[PDB]
Amino acid sequence: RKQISVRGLAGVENVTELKKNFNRHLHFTLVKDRNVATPRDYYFALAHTVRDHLVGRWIRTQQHYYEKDPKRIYYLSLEFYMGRTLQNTMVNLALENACDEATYQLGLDMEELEEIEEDAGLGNGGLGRLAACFLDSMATLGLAAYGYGIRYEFGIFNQKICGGWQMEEADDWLRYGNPWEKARPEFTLPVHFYGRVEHTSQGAKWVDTQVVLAMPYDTPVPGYRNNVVNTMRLWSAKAPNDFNLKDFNVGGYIQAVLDRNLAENISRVLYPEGKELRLKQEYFVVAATLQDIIRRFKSSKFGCRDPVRTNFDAFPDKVAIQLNDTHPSLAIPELMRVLVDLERLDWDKAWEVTVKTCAYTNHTVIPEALERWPVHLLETLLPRHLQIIYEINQRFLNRVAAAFPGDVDRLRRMSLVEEGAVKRINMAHLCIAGSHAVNGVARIHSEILKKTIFKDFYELEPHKFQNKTNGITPRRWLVLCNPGLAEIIAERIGEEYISDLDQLRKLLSYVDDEAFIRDVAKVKQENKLKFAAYLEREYKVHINPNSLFDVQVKRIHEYKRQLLNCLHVITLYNRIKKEPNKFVVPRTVMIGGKAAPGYHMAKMIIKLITAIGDVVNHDPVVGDRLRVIFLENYRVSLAEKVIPAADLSEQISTAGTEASGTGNMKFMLNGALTIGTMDGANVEMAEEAGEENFFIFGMRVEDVDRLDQRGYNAQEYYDRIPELRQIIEQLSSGFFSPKQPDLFKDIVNMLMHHDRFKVFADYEEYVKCQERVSALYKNPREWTRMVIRNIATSGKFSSDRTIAQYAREIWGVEPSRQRLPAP
Amino acid sequence: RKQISVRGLAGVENVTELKKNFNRHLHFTLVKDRNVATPRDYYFALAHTVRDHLVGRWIRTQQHYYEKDPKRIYYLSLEFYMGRTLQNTMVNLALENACDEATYQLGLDMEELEEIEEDAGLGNGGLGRLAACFLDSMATLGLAAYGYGIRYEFGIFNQKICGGWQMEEADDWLRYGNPWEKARPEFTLPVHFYGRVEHTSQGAKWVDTQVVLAMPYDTPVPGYRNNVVNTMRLWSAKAPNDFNLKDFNVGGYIQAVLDRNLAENISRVLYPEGKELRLKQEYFVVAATLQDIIRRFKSSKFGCRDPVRTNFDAFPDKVAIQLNDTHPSLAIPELMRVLVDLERLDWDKAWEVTVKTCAYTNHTVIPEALERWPVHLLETLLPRHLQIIYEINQRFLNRVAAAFPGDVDRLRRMSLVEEGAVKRINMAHLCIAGSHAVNGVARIHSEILKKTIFKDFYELEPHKFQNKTNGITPRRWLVLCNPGLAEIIAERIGEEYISDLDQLRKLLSYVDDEAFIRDVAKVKQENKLKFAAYLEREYKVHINPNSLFDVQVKRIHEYKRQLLNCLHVITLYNRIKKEPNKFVVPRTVMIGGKAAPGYHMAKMIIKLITAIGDVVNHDPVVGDRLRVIFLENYRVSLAEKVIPAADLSEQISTAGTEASGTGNMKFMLNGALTIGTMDGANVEMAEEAGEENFFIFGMRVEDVDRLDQRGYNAQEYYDRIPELRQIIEQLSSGFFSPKQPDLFKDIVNMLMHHDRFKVFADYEEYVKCQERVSALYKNPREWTRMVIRNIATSGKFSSDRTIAQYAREIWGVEPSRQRLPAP
C-alpha cells in the first residue's frame, strides 16, 4: 500500500525518457502506430507525454493542500479563455527544451505539431482571457486555487471572412477529444431547475424539480517554475436517462426529447439578452460548484474538524468565492439556500458567512451593461431563490433605512427589485448586498463605480469598494510569444523579472547603451519579418516587413472606434494620392476583431475595412507606402503572433468608455508605443511611463461631458475640415465600393448624423498626433529609446501584482513564490 | 519515423514491471491517488496495466495482416455478448499469476477487483453469446477475423426481482468508462436514410437522404496464448451537429431536435415487430461496416495491387462476410448498391461477387420467426435498396423458372416478396439467394431446413446448404470459469485440450482411477461451496452445500418450460410433506433468466417460481431437503458462477423446438449431468457421451406431431395423474399465492386449455426420470463416473472445432494454432 506512491514516476530532463513516454502515449494510450498516425496523433501523444509530468506535480500539490490546509479560493467565471496549452505548459514546467530535442530525434518538428492545437473554446473577450491569466498567477504565487466555469463544446464561433463580409463558422474544438482534461464520471452532481417551494416545519422544501447532471472535468494549470499545478474544474450538463421508460413520464409521450436537449445545450453554446438558457447556465455552474466547494470544506480535515456542525464559522477562513462579474451572482442565494435550508442554519449566521466569503468584480463603465433578470423567470424556474432574494432585499433595505432614515428614494434606488413595466432583479445590487468587497479593474473605472454607478452603495459601505487594476502574465505575453526580447532582457537584468516584473526598471540604466538599443530594434525586426511571413504563408498580402506596423486588435464595436482609425487611413491615402513624391513614413495598418453576430454596424465596418483594402492596396501610386489588412479570426493564438510585431498600438476609445482594457498592456511589454485616449488603463500606463513617452491624444472625459451638454453637432466638424468633408463624400459616391455605391450609406449617415461616440471630435487631433508618431518612427534610435522606457516601466501591469493585491486585500492569504520540492 | 516503435515498452511476465505500470496508470491515466482511490479505481489502474500488453500485440497483429494480406473475415452480428474482460485477457496472455502477485505485493487482492467489472452489455442470449465465443476461437485459430456490431450504450435491461415480480432497470454499464475500448472519432462515417432515387444517364443516384454518423469503437480480442489479437469494432450512431443555424432548416424550427435523438437511439438500446427503428438499427450496423470492409480491400496494400478496377474479382478471394442470422441481410443489396451504383460494375459482375461473399448462419426453425420487412417500409427509408432487392427477385425467380419450368406455384412460393394484406420482403429468402453457403447450427436443425423450411432452395441449390454445429470456447467456459477442474484435468493429461478439446477422451482411462474420481467429485464440492456463499453474500437464502444443485438457466419463455420444472418442485414439495420422514435426496432447484418485457406469461412464470420459493423455503417440515431459488439478472458472469456449481443441467424444451443451445454444452464440460428432451444439441451430446450417460426423456419430435395429429387434450392427463390434479388445484385455490387466490388464473387456464407446448404430456415421464436422477445421486462413485464420462466426451463442442469447419468448408481459409511472433 504506501508502495502505491507517486514516487516512482518521472525521469524528467532526459530526451531518451521523453522519446520513450511519447512512443508509449502514441502506441498504448492512442492505440495507433506510425503506419497510420497523423500530425494530430503525434500531437496528442506529445501533449499526453507532457501531461504525465504535469499530473505528477498536481498530485503532490493537491496532497499538499490537504496536509497544510489553507484558504482555497474559487474563481467563478462562465468564460475561461485559455487558448492553446502545450508550449505554455513546457515553459512554466521547464520541459521546453527537453521536448524539442526528443521530437527532433523522433523526427517530428515541434512547431508543426504546436499549431495543430486549437484554442481552448471556452472563451470570448477580456473577461475569460483575464480569468486564464489570473489562474497562471494563482499558481505562481502558490495559492490553493480553483477556477470553475462550464465546459462548452462549441466555443465562440470561428471567423471566416468571405468577400469582406464576416461569416460565423463553429469552434468544435473538442472534436477529437482534449488531451489535457480528465473526466470525472465519479463526481457527477445533480443541479435542480423548476420546483415548487413548499413551506414546512423548520423551513421550506424545494419540491418537484427537473434535475440535470453536472459532470466535472479537470484541466490542470502549472505555475511558472514552482512545482505547483492547480486545477480548473469545468462542468458538463448531462441528462438523467430513464428517458425511454423509467419514472414513466415516457412510453406514452416521449416529448422528454426536449428535457434532454435543453439540458444538453447548457454546455453547448457560449454567448458572444434575456434567454432562459443564459440563466439556466449561470445557475448550473454555480450550483454544481458550490456542492464541490462545501464538499471539500467538510472533507479537508474538517468532516473530522467539526466542533459544532463542522460550522461554517470557519467557512470564511477556508473558502473564497470570487464572483468575476454578475454572471456568478446566484452564488449568494445558492449559498444561503444550501446553508439555511439543507444545513439548518439561520439567517443572520448564514448571511455572516455568505458576505464574509463572497467578493464581486465589476468590469463595466456604463449602467446599461449590468444584468437584471425579469422576476417571473426566476419565479418559474428558480422559486426558492426568488424568495431568498426578496428576504435579502428586505433586510439590506432596512440597513439603508437605518443609515439614511426617512429617505424614500434611496430605498427605491438601491433595491434589488427594479419596478417598471417588466419588474426586474438587479444582479449587481444582489452581489453588492451579498459581497464583502466590491472592486474595479483600472483606477478610473473603480472610481466611476464609487462615484456614479454604485455611489448609493458606496456611501452605505465605503469600506467595500476597492480597486484592483488588471494585468497580464509575463509567461504568455513575453517569454512565450516573444522569446527574442525575453532573452536580451535576461542577460541585462537576470531571470527574476518573469516571477517579479517591476525589475524591468533595471533596463532604465541601459536606455542609452547603443548595444541594447540595436538588440531591442533587432528583435522587433525579426518579429515583423516573421509575421510578414505567417501572413503570407497562412494566407498572403505584399507586406513591407520594414513599414510602421499599426495595430488595432480590439472587439469590433462603435465605442472602440475602428472608424476613427479608418478615417485616418483614408486621410493618409488621400495625401499620398494628392502629392505622389512627398515622403510619407510608410505604414501597414492591420485591424482585427470578430464583429458580434448581426451587430449591423460592425459587420458593415469589417466590409469597409476590406474596401479601403482592395482600393489602396491595389492602387499603383500608393505603392507600398500605405497598406490595410483586416486580421482574420482574431484569437489568443493570433495575439501571441501579431502583438510581438507591433510598433504602434491603437488604443483610441472614447474618453470614459473603456473600463480598463488589457491588450493595451500586452502591447507595452512587447515594445510598441501607444496612441490612445486618456482612458482605461492608458492612464496608469502613461502615469508609470511618463506621458512624454506615451502618445496621449483626444478629448479627456471632461471635454466629452461638456460636448454632450452643449450638443455634439457632428456637421460643424465636417464643415470646418476639408479632408473629412472629402473622405465622407468619397465613401458616399462609392469611392471605395463602386459595384453598389450607395452601400456605405448607413455608415456615412451614422457618423454624420448620429454618432454617439464622437468620431469627428477627435479627428482633427488624432491625425495631428499620428503625424508626431510617424516622425519619431522615422528616427530609429529614439523610437527604440521611447520603447525601452515603456518596457522598463511594464511592472505594475503583471497579473502577479494583481493577485498579490486580491490575496492580501480582498481574500486574506499572503502569496508565496517558493518552488515546491516534488515530483 | 523508424525511431517511433512498439519495441522498448514492456517487461511482460514481470511482477515488478507490472507493479510499476499499475502505479503510472492509477496516478497518470486515472489522475487519482491512493489517498483517494476507490475499488472501482484500482481496477482501472489494473485494467489499464493489463491493456498495454493486450494492445502492443494488437499493433503487431494488425500490421501483420496488412503485410501478409490474408483473405479477411467479418462476423456481422447485431449482439456480441462479451461480458467481463480482465481475467480472459489475463489468462489468454498468461499474465494471471504475475498480476495476482503484483497486485498482491501492492496489497490489494486481485479477486476483489475482478468483480467490480460490470458485464460488457452488448448482447442478450444465444445468438450473441455465440458470436463472442467464435471471436476467441477465430483469434486462437490465428485467423484474420473481425467483429462488427453496434455499440449499445444501454445494452438491454438489468433484471431486478421486486416483490417476486420482474423489474427491468437500465444497464448503463458505460457508466465510468469501459477500459477495454478505444474511441476512434476520426473514422466516423455517413449512414444514409430516406431520400429518393434519381435515375441519371448511366444509373440511379440516391439523393436527399438524411445522414447519421457512425462512430467506431475498437476492442482488441486476444486469442489463447497465440499472440494474435483481433478486433471487434462496434459503431455508436450520432446526430450531425449542424442543428442550430447551419443549414437554414432550423433557427426558425428546431423541431428536428427529434432527428437528433431518433438518430442517437439507434445505438441506445438492444431489442429486447416491424419497427422502423429495428430496420434502422440493421441498416446502420451494415453500412458503416461495408465501407470499412471495401475500404480495407482498397487501402490494405491492394490499392497498389489493383490490376484492373482494384478488382472486386479479387474481392471474394480476399474478403468474406458472415450474416449471423437475418439481422445483417441488407449487407447483400447494400453491397450490390456499393458495387453497381457507387463503384461501376454491371449487375452480374456485382452479383457474382455478392453471392460469392455472403454465407449466412441460421438459428430459427419455426416459419413464424423468419425476418420479414414491409415493402412500403423499405420504400420510405431505403428506396434504392428495395429497388435492388426487386432486381434480385426478378432474376432469382427467372433462374428458378429455368430450373422448375412449368411451375408457377413454386415461383410464387420461392420469391423474396410475400403477398397478403401487407406485402412483405422475406429477408430469409434474400439471404439465401445472395449467398454461397447457408448452414444450420446443429444436424437435426440443418436438415429440417433442407427438408421443410428451405426445401425448394435445396432442390435448386443443393450444394449450398451445409451445417456447422454450435460449440463453445473452452477458455471462458472451463479454464477461466473452472480453475479447479482445469487443474486436475491438467494433472492427468496436460494443456493441449485447452487449445484442442476432443483431446479430453484421454480421460476415459481414468474412469475408474480412484484418485481421479475423488478429485472430480472434490472440485465440485468446492464449486458448490462458494456458490452457496454468494447465495448468502450478494443476495440471501441458506443453501445446503450437500444438495443436488438442480439448475435451469433459459430465456423465460413458455416452450423452454420452467413450468414443467415448477410442477416437479411442487410434486417434491407435496411428497416431502405427505411423508416427512421418507429419505428423499436433498435438492436446490435454482431457475434464472430474463422475461423480456411485456411477455405476460413469462412475467407470471417468474412470479410462480418465486411464489413456490417463498412457500417451500419457509415450510418447517421441509428443513433443507428442498429449496426453490430464482437467480436474478442472469447474464455471462453469473453463468460462469452457477455452471461450475450445477450438478443437473435441465435442458427440457418441447421435443423439436430448440435448434441447438450453447449452454447445453457449458454444463457438460463442467460436470453436470444433463436431464433433457431429445432435441437441439442434446441429440449430438447423447450421441457423443452415449445415451445412457444422459437423462433423455419425454416425447420425441415423432410423437409430438402425432399428438397434434389426434389432438392434445390436457384434461385427460389431468384425469389420470393424481399428483397433477393436486398441483392444478393448489395453483388455483391460491395455496401459493394466499393474499390473491385467483393470481395464477392465467397459468392454470393456459396449461389446461391452450398450451401450445404439451407440458402435461411430458409430466409422468419427467417425474420418473428425475426419480432416477436422485437415485443415482444417492451413490457418489457412479454419478461421478457418469460425469467423468460426460466431461471426457465434451470435445465435439469446442468453438475451435466449429470455427474450423467454417474456415475450411465456407470461408475457405486455414486455421492455425501456431504462435504469431510479437510482443
Ligand SMILES: Nc1ncnc2c1ncn2[C@@H]1O[C@H](COP(=O)(O)O)[C@@H](O)[C@H]1O
Ligand atoms: N483526505 C485527503 N488527504 C490527502 N490528499 C487528499 C485528500 N482528499 C483529497 N486529496 C488530494 O486531492 C485530490 C482530489 O482533489 P478534490 O477534487 O479536491 O478532492 C486527491 O487526488 C489528492 O491529491
Ligand SMILES: Nc1ncnc2c1ncn2[C@@H]1O[C@H](COP(=O)(O)O)[C@@H](O)[C@H]1O
Ligand atoms: N498500411 C499499413 N501498414 C501497416 N500496418 C497497418 C497499415 N494499415 C493499418 N495497419 C495496422 O492495422 C491497424 C488497424 O487499421 P485500420 O484498418 O486502419 O483500423 C492499425 O492501427 C495498424 O496497427
Ligand SMILES: *Cc1c(COP(=O)(O)O)cnc(C)c1O
Ligand atoms: C488580450 C486579448 C483580448 C483583450 O481585449 P482588450 O480590449 O484588449 O482588453 C481579447 N482577445 C484576445 C485574443 C486577446 O489576446
Ligand SMILES: *Cc1c(COP(=O)(O)O)cnc(C)c1O
Ligand atoms: C451460453 C449463454 C447463454 C446461452 O443460452 P442457452 O439456453 O444455453 O442457449 C445464455 N446466457 C448466457 C449468460 C450464456 O453464457
